[PDB]
């Protein structure tokens, strides 16, 4: 076939009941994640190719960057709670990987402040139980698929994208293949 299990995707041998429809994992420490998000715009080209009625979910992971890595999972929970993902994703990637100006939780906080979130509102969210359960959700989703590498994407808790099985000579063509594959998998 044109799409083959084991070729553009793999099937989870033990399926995750109740998983989000399209589930992407990343780390702000992750070089390919920077590429995926800042250069290739994978997340954006996929939602643009999802059928109607299928929502997209993106979670941060702990297993890179030690203590700062965990802080970033909590900050991403704050990003989700406040609905400001599209305001902090770029300065967080660039702060960690480009300028390397993010070294502490306070430096992460500065990014939100500069993005216009009030300090009092950030701090309230950071310490909130709604954010704690959002952190838990991120951890549980990663645990459900025994996640060990990023970037990663899962469709319906059953299939895992396999981008190594794709031509990267043209960046545009790779992104649309990736997106078209997610669409295919979501209609499975």
Short mmCIF file of C-alpha atoms in Angstrom, two decimals:
data_model
loop_
_atom_site.label_atom_id
_atom_site.label_comp_id
_atom_site.label_asym_id
_atom_site.label_seq_id
_atom_site.Cartn_x
_atom_site.Cartn_y
_atom_site.Cartn_z
CA UNK A 1 0.00 0.00 0.00
CA UNK A 2 1.01 3.69 -0.04
CA UNK A 3 0.80 3.95 3.73
CA UNK A 4 2.38 0.95 5.48
CA UNK A 5 2.43 0.06 9.14
CA UNK A 6 6.09 0.07 10.05
CA UNK A 7 6.86 2.50 7.22
CA UNK A 8 5.33 6.00 7.72
CA UNK A 9 3.84 5.07 11.04
CA UNK A 10 3.95 2.33 13.64
CA UNK A 11 1.07 0.76 15.53
CA UNK A 12 1.22 0.65 19.29
CA UNK A 13 1.26 -2.98 20.43
CA UNK A 14 -0.60 -1.91 23.54
CA UNK A 15 -3.25 0.77 22.63
CA UNK A 16 -4.10 3.70 24.89
CA UNK A 17 -7.84 3.95 25.59
CA UNK A 18 -9.28 7.47 25.86
CA UNK A 19 -6.25 9.23 24.35
CA UNK A 20 -6.48 12.64 22.63
CA UNK A 21 -7.18 12.44 18.86
CA UNK A 22 -3.93 14.05 17.73
CA UNK A 23 -1.26 14.22 20.40
CA UNK A 24 2.14 15.85 19.88
CA UNK A 25 5.05 15.75 22.36
CA UNK A 26 8.03 18.10 22.44
CA UNK A 27 10.70 19.63 24.63
CA UNK A 28 11.99 23.19 24.46
CA UNK A 29 15.45 21.56 24.81
CA UNK A 30 14.93 19.33 21.80
CA UNK A 31 16.80 20.39 18.63
CA UNK A 32 14.50 18.60 16.18
CA UNK A 33 11.55 20.08 18.10
CA UNK A 34 12.95 23.54 17.40
CA UNK A 35 13.14 22.57 13.73
CA UNK A 36 9.68 21.00 13.76
CA UNK A 37 8.12 24.02 15.33
CA UNK A 38 10.18 27.02 14.28
CA UNK A 39 11.23 26.06 10.72
CA UNK A 40 8.92 23.29 9.47
CA UNK A 41 5.77 24.41 11.34
CA UNK A 42 4.54 20.83 11.65
CA UNK A 43 1.96 21.51 14.32
CA UNK A 44 0.47 24.22 12.11
CA UNK A 45 0.42 22.29 8.87
CA UNK A 46 -1.23 19.27 10.55
CA UNK A 47 -4.19 21.14 12.18
CA UNK A 48 -4.58 22.74 8.81
CA UNK A 49 -4.98 19.30 7.43
CA UNK A 50 -7.14 17.68 10.18
CA UNK A 51 -10.78 16.68 9.37
CA UNK A 52 -13.57 18.65 11.03
CA UNK A 53 -14.18 17.53 14.64
CA UNK A 54 -10.64 16.40 15.41
CA UNK A 55 -8.86 18.60 17.99
CA UNK A 56 -5.08 18.84 18.42
CA UNK A 57 -3.17 18.50 21.68
CA UNK A 58 0.48 19.39 22.39
CA UNK A 59 2.34 18.42 25.57
CA UNK A 60 5.79 19.17 26.95
CA UNK A 61 8.04 16.45 28.42
CA UNK A 62 10.30 16.09 31.44
CA UNK A 63 13.00 13.72 30.24
CA UNK A 64 15.24 16.42 28.73
CA UNK A 65 17.04 19.25 30.50
CA UNK A 66 16.75 18.05 34.09
CA UNK A 67 15.40 20.53 36.57
CA UNK A 68 14.85 23.28 33.96
CA UNK A 69 13.09 20.71 31.78
CA UNK A 70 10.54 20.06 34.54
CA UNK A 71 10.09 23.81 35.05
CA UNK A 72 9.30 24.07 31.36
CA UNK A 73 6.63 21.37 31.60
CA UNK A 74 5.01 23.41 34.36
CA UNK A 75 5.34 26.64 32.29
CA UNK A 76 3.76 24.89 29.35
CA UNK A 77 0.86 23.97 31.73
CA UNK A 78 0.62 27.71 32.53
CA UNK A 79 0.69 28.43 28.78
CA UNK A 80 -2.22 26.02 28.27
CA UNK A 81 -4.21 27.29 31.23
CA UNK A 82 -3.93 30.90 30.11
CA UNK A 83 -4.31 30.10 26.40
CA UNK A 84 -1.09 31.89 25.46
CA UNK A 85 0.78 29.09 23.68
CA UNK A 86 1.02 31.10 20.46
CA UNK A 87 2.67 33.95 22.36
CA UNK A 88 5.34 32.07 24.29
CA UNK A 89 6.33 29.12 22.09
CA UNK A 90 8.78 31.12 19.93
CA UNK A 91 10.55 33.06 22.73
CA UNK A 92 10.81 29.89 24.85
CA UNK A 93 12.47 27.89 22.03
CA UNK A 94 14.77 30.79 21.15
CA UNK A 95 15.44 31.51 24.83
CA UNK A 96 16.51 27.94 25.45
CA UNK A 97 18.24 27.12 22.13
CA UNK A 98 19.10 30.32 20.28
CA UNK A 99 20.09 33.00 22.78
CA UNK A 100 20.47 30.53 25.69
CA UNK A 101 19.10 33.16 28.04
CA UNK A 102 16.74 30.78 29.81
CA UNK A 103 18.61 29.26 32.74
CA UNK A 104 16.13 29.46 35.59
CA UNK A 105 12.44 29.42 36.41
CA UNK A 106 12.70 33.20 36.75
CA UNK A 107 14.04 33.42 33.19
CA UNK A 108 11.06 31.43 31.99
CA UNK A 109 8.79 33.81 33.87
CA UNK A 110 10.48 36.79 32.13
CA UNK A 111 9.39 35.38 28.75
CA UNK A 112 5.73 35.43 29.82
CA UNK A 113 6.07 38.95 31.27
CA UNK A 114 7.66 40.20 28.05
CA UNK A 115 4.85 38.47 26.13
CA UNK A 116 2.42 40.60 28.15
CA UNK A 117 1.11 38.20 30.80
CA UNK A 118 0.93 40.05 34.12
CA UNK A 119 3.32 38.86 36.83
CA UNK A 120 0.58 38.37 39.39
CA UNK A 121 -1.43 36.34 36.85
CA UNK A 122 1.55 34.20 35.89
CA UNK A 123 2.43 33.52 39.53
CA UNK A 124 -1.15 32.70 40.48
CA UNK A 125 -1.33 30.23 37.58
CA UNK A 126 2.12 28.78 38.27
CA UNK A 127 1.04 27.91 41.82
CA UNK A 128 -2.52 26.83 40.96
CA UNK A 129 -3.95 23.34 41.30
CA UNK A 130 -5.48 23.67 37.81
CA UNK A 131 -1.90 23.93 36.52
CA UNK A 132 -0.84 20.99 38.77
CA UNK A 133 -3.47 18.75 37.15
CA UNK A 134 -2.43 20.06 33.74
CA UNK A 135 1.15 18.95 34.58
CA UNK A 136 -0.24 15.56 35.63
CA UNK A 137 -2.12 15.26 32.31
CA UNK A 138 1.12 15.87 30.39
CA UNK A 139 3.00 13.33 32.46
CA UNK A 140 0.26 10.70 32.16
CA UNK A 141 -0.06 11.03 28.38
CA UNK A 142 3.67 10.51 27.96
CA UNK A 143 3.62 7.59 30.38
CA UNK A 144 0.69 5.95 28.54
CA UNK A 145 2.91 5.57 25.43
CA UNK A 146 6.18 4.86 27.28
CA UNK A 147 7.55 8.01 25.68
CA UNK A 148 11.22 8.23 25.30
CA UNK A 149 11.89 10.47 22.38
CA UNK A 150 10.78 13.72 21.02
CA UNK A 151 9.48 15.06 18.73
CA UNK A 152 6.63 12.55 18.63
CA UNK A 153 3.07 12.43 17.41
CA UNK A 154 0.29 9.95 18.11
CA UNK A 155 -3.10 9.52 16.52
CA UNK A 156 -6.01 8.11 18.57
CA UNK A 157 -3.67 6.41 21.03
CA UNK A 158 -3.03 3.73 18.40
CA UNK A 159 -0.55 5.01 15.85
CA UNK A 160 2.78 6.78 16.08
CA UNK A 161 4.18 8.90 13.26
CA UNK A 162 7.44 7.62 11.73
CA UNK A 163 9.12 10.57 9.95
CA UNK A 164 12.46 8.72 9.50
CA UNK A 165 10.67 6.93 6.69
CA UNK A 166 10.46 10.18 4.61
CA UNK A 167 12.43 12.36 2.10
CA UNK A 168 13.80 15.48 3.79
CA UNK A 169 15.47 17.03 0.71
CA UNK A 170 12.60 19.48 0.32
CA UNK A 171 11.27 20.88 3.61
CA UNK A 172 7.82 21.81 2.15
CA UNK A 173 7.27 18.32 0.72
CA UNK A 174 8.27 16.63 3.97
CA UNK A 175 5.82 18.72 6.02
CA UNK A 176 2.87 17.97 3.70
CA UNK A 177 3.73 14.26 3.67
CA UNK A 178 3.77 14.35 7.46
CA UNK A 179 0.48 16.26 7.54
CA UNK A 180 -1.18 14.05 4.88
CA UNK A 181 -0.10 11.01 6.89
CA UNK A 182 -1.71 12.34 10.08
CA UNK A 183 -4.91 12.98 8.10
CA UNK A 184 -4.84 9.44 6.70
CA UNK A 185 -4.24 8.00 10.15
CA UNK A 186 -7.07 10.08 11.62
CA UNK A 187 -9.52 8.66 9.04
CA UNK A 188 -8.44 5.11 9.87
#
